[PDB]
């Protein structure tokens, strides 16, 4: 799925 704003 969408997850372009990064990892956390």
């Amino acid at each position, epitope marked *: *799925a*969408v*997850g*372009t*704003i*990064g*990892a*956390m």
Partner: antibody
Amino acid sequence: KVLVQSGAEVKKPGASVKVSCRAFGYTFTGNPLHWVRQAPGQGLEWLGWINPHSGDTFTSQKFQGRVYMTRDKSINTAFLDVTRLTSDDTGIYYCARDKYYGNEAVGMDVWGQGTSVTVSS
Amino acid sequence: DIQLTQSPSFLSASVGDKVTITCRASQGVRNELAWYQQKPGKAPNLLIYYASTLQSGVPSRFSATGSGTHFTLTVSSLQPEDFATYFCQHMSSYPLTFGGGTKVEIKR
């Protein structure tokens, strides 16, 4: 656990509104925050989401250049700026945390009580 | 964009009925779909994610399945609390999109 949003707002056409959203009971910088709005009687519309740790954002294409997501980590608060308001922006604005399992969108876990925005002369 | 059609939009059923809601996706969204329940006056509540996994605290009467473009949500036996409006949502590409919603009303 809990997302607390700011109070209702009444604005004239062409004005701007700043809604705020504060996080409680979990690490503010551990989950993306979505922004979703609902016009009186209608369905849900996604505005964008923000990485509270980095401030990175993706704003929904329909609203790019008109809606701005920011955050203040020192007080676990996220901000949504909606500019150049028309009557099409009247409705309730929600902030919602994403579970973000696997570093990837999964579902909107925790919602705020919502902020009402009325655009009218 | 990428639209989700919910069928039916309005549904009347009485307490204890088994009911099934359908979400159809304009494009393939492999498994990346969620279901929400919203009562008037509230923010939505998450019921299902990964198209079929129950969110913590959701009663077992709720269940859902779905593959690619056809998804369904089912309540085995409706309860007073289950009467509300239900939305599907995908997260396969930008922008995230919700279905138009299904309002489930008490038949009397």
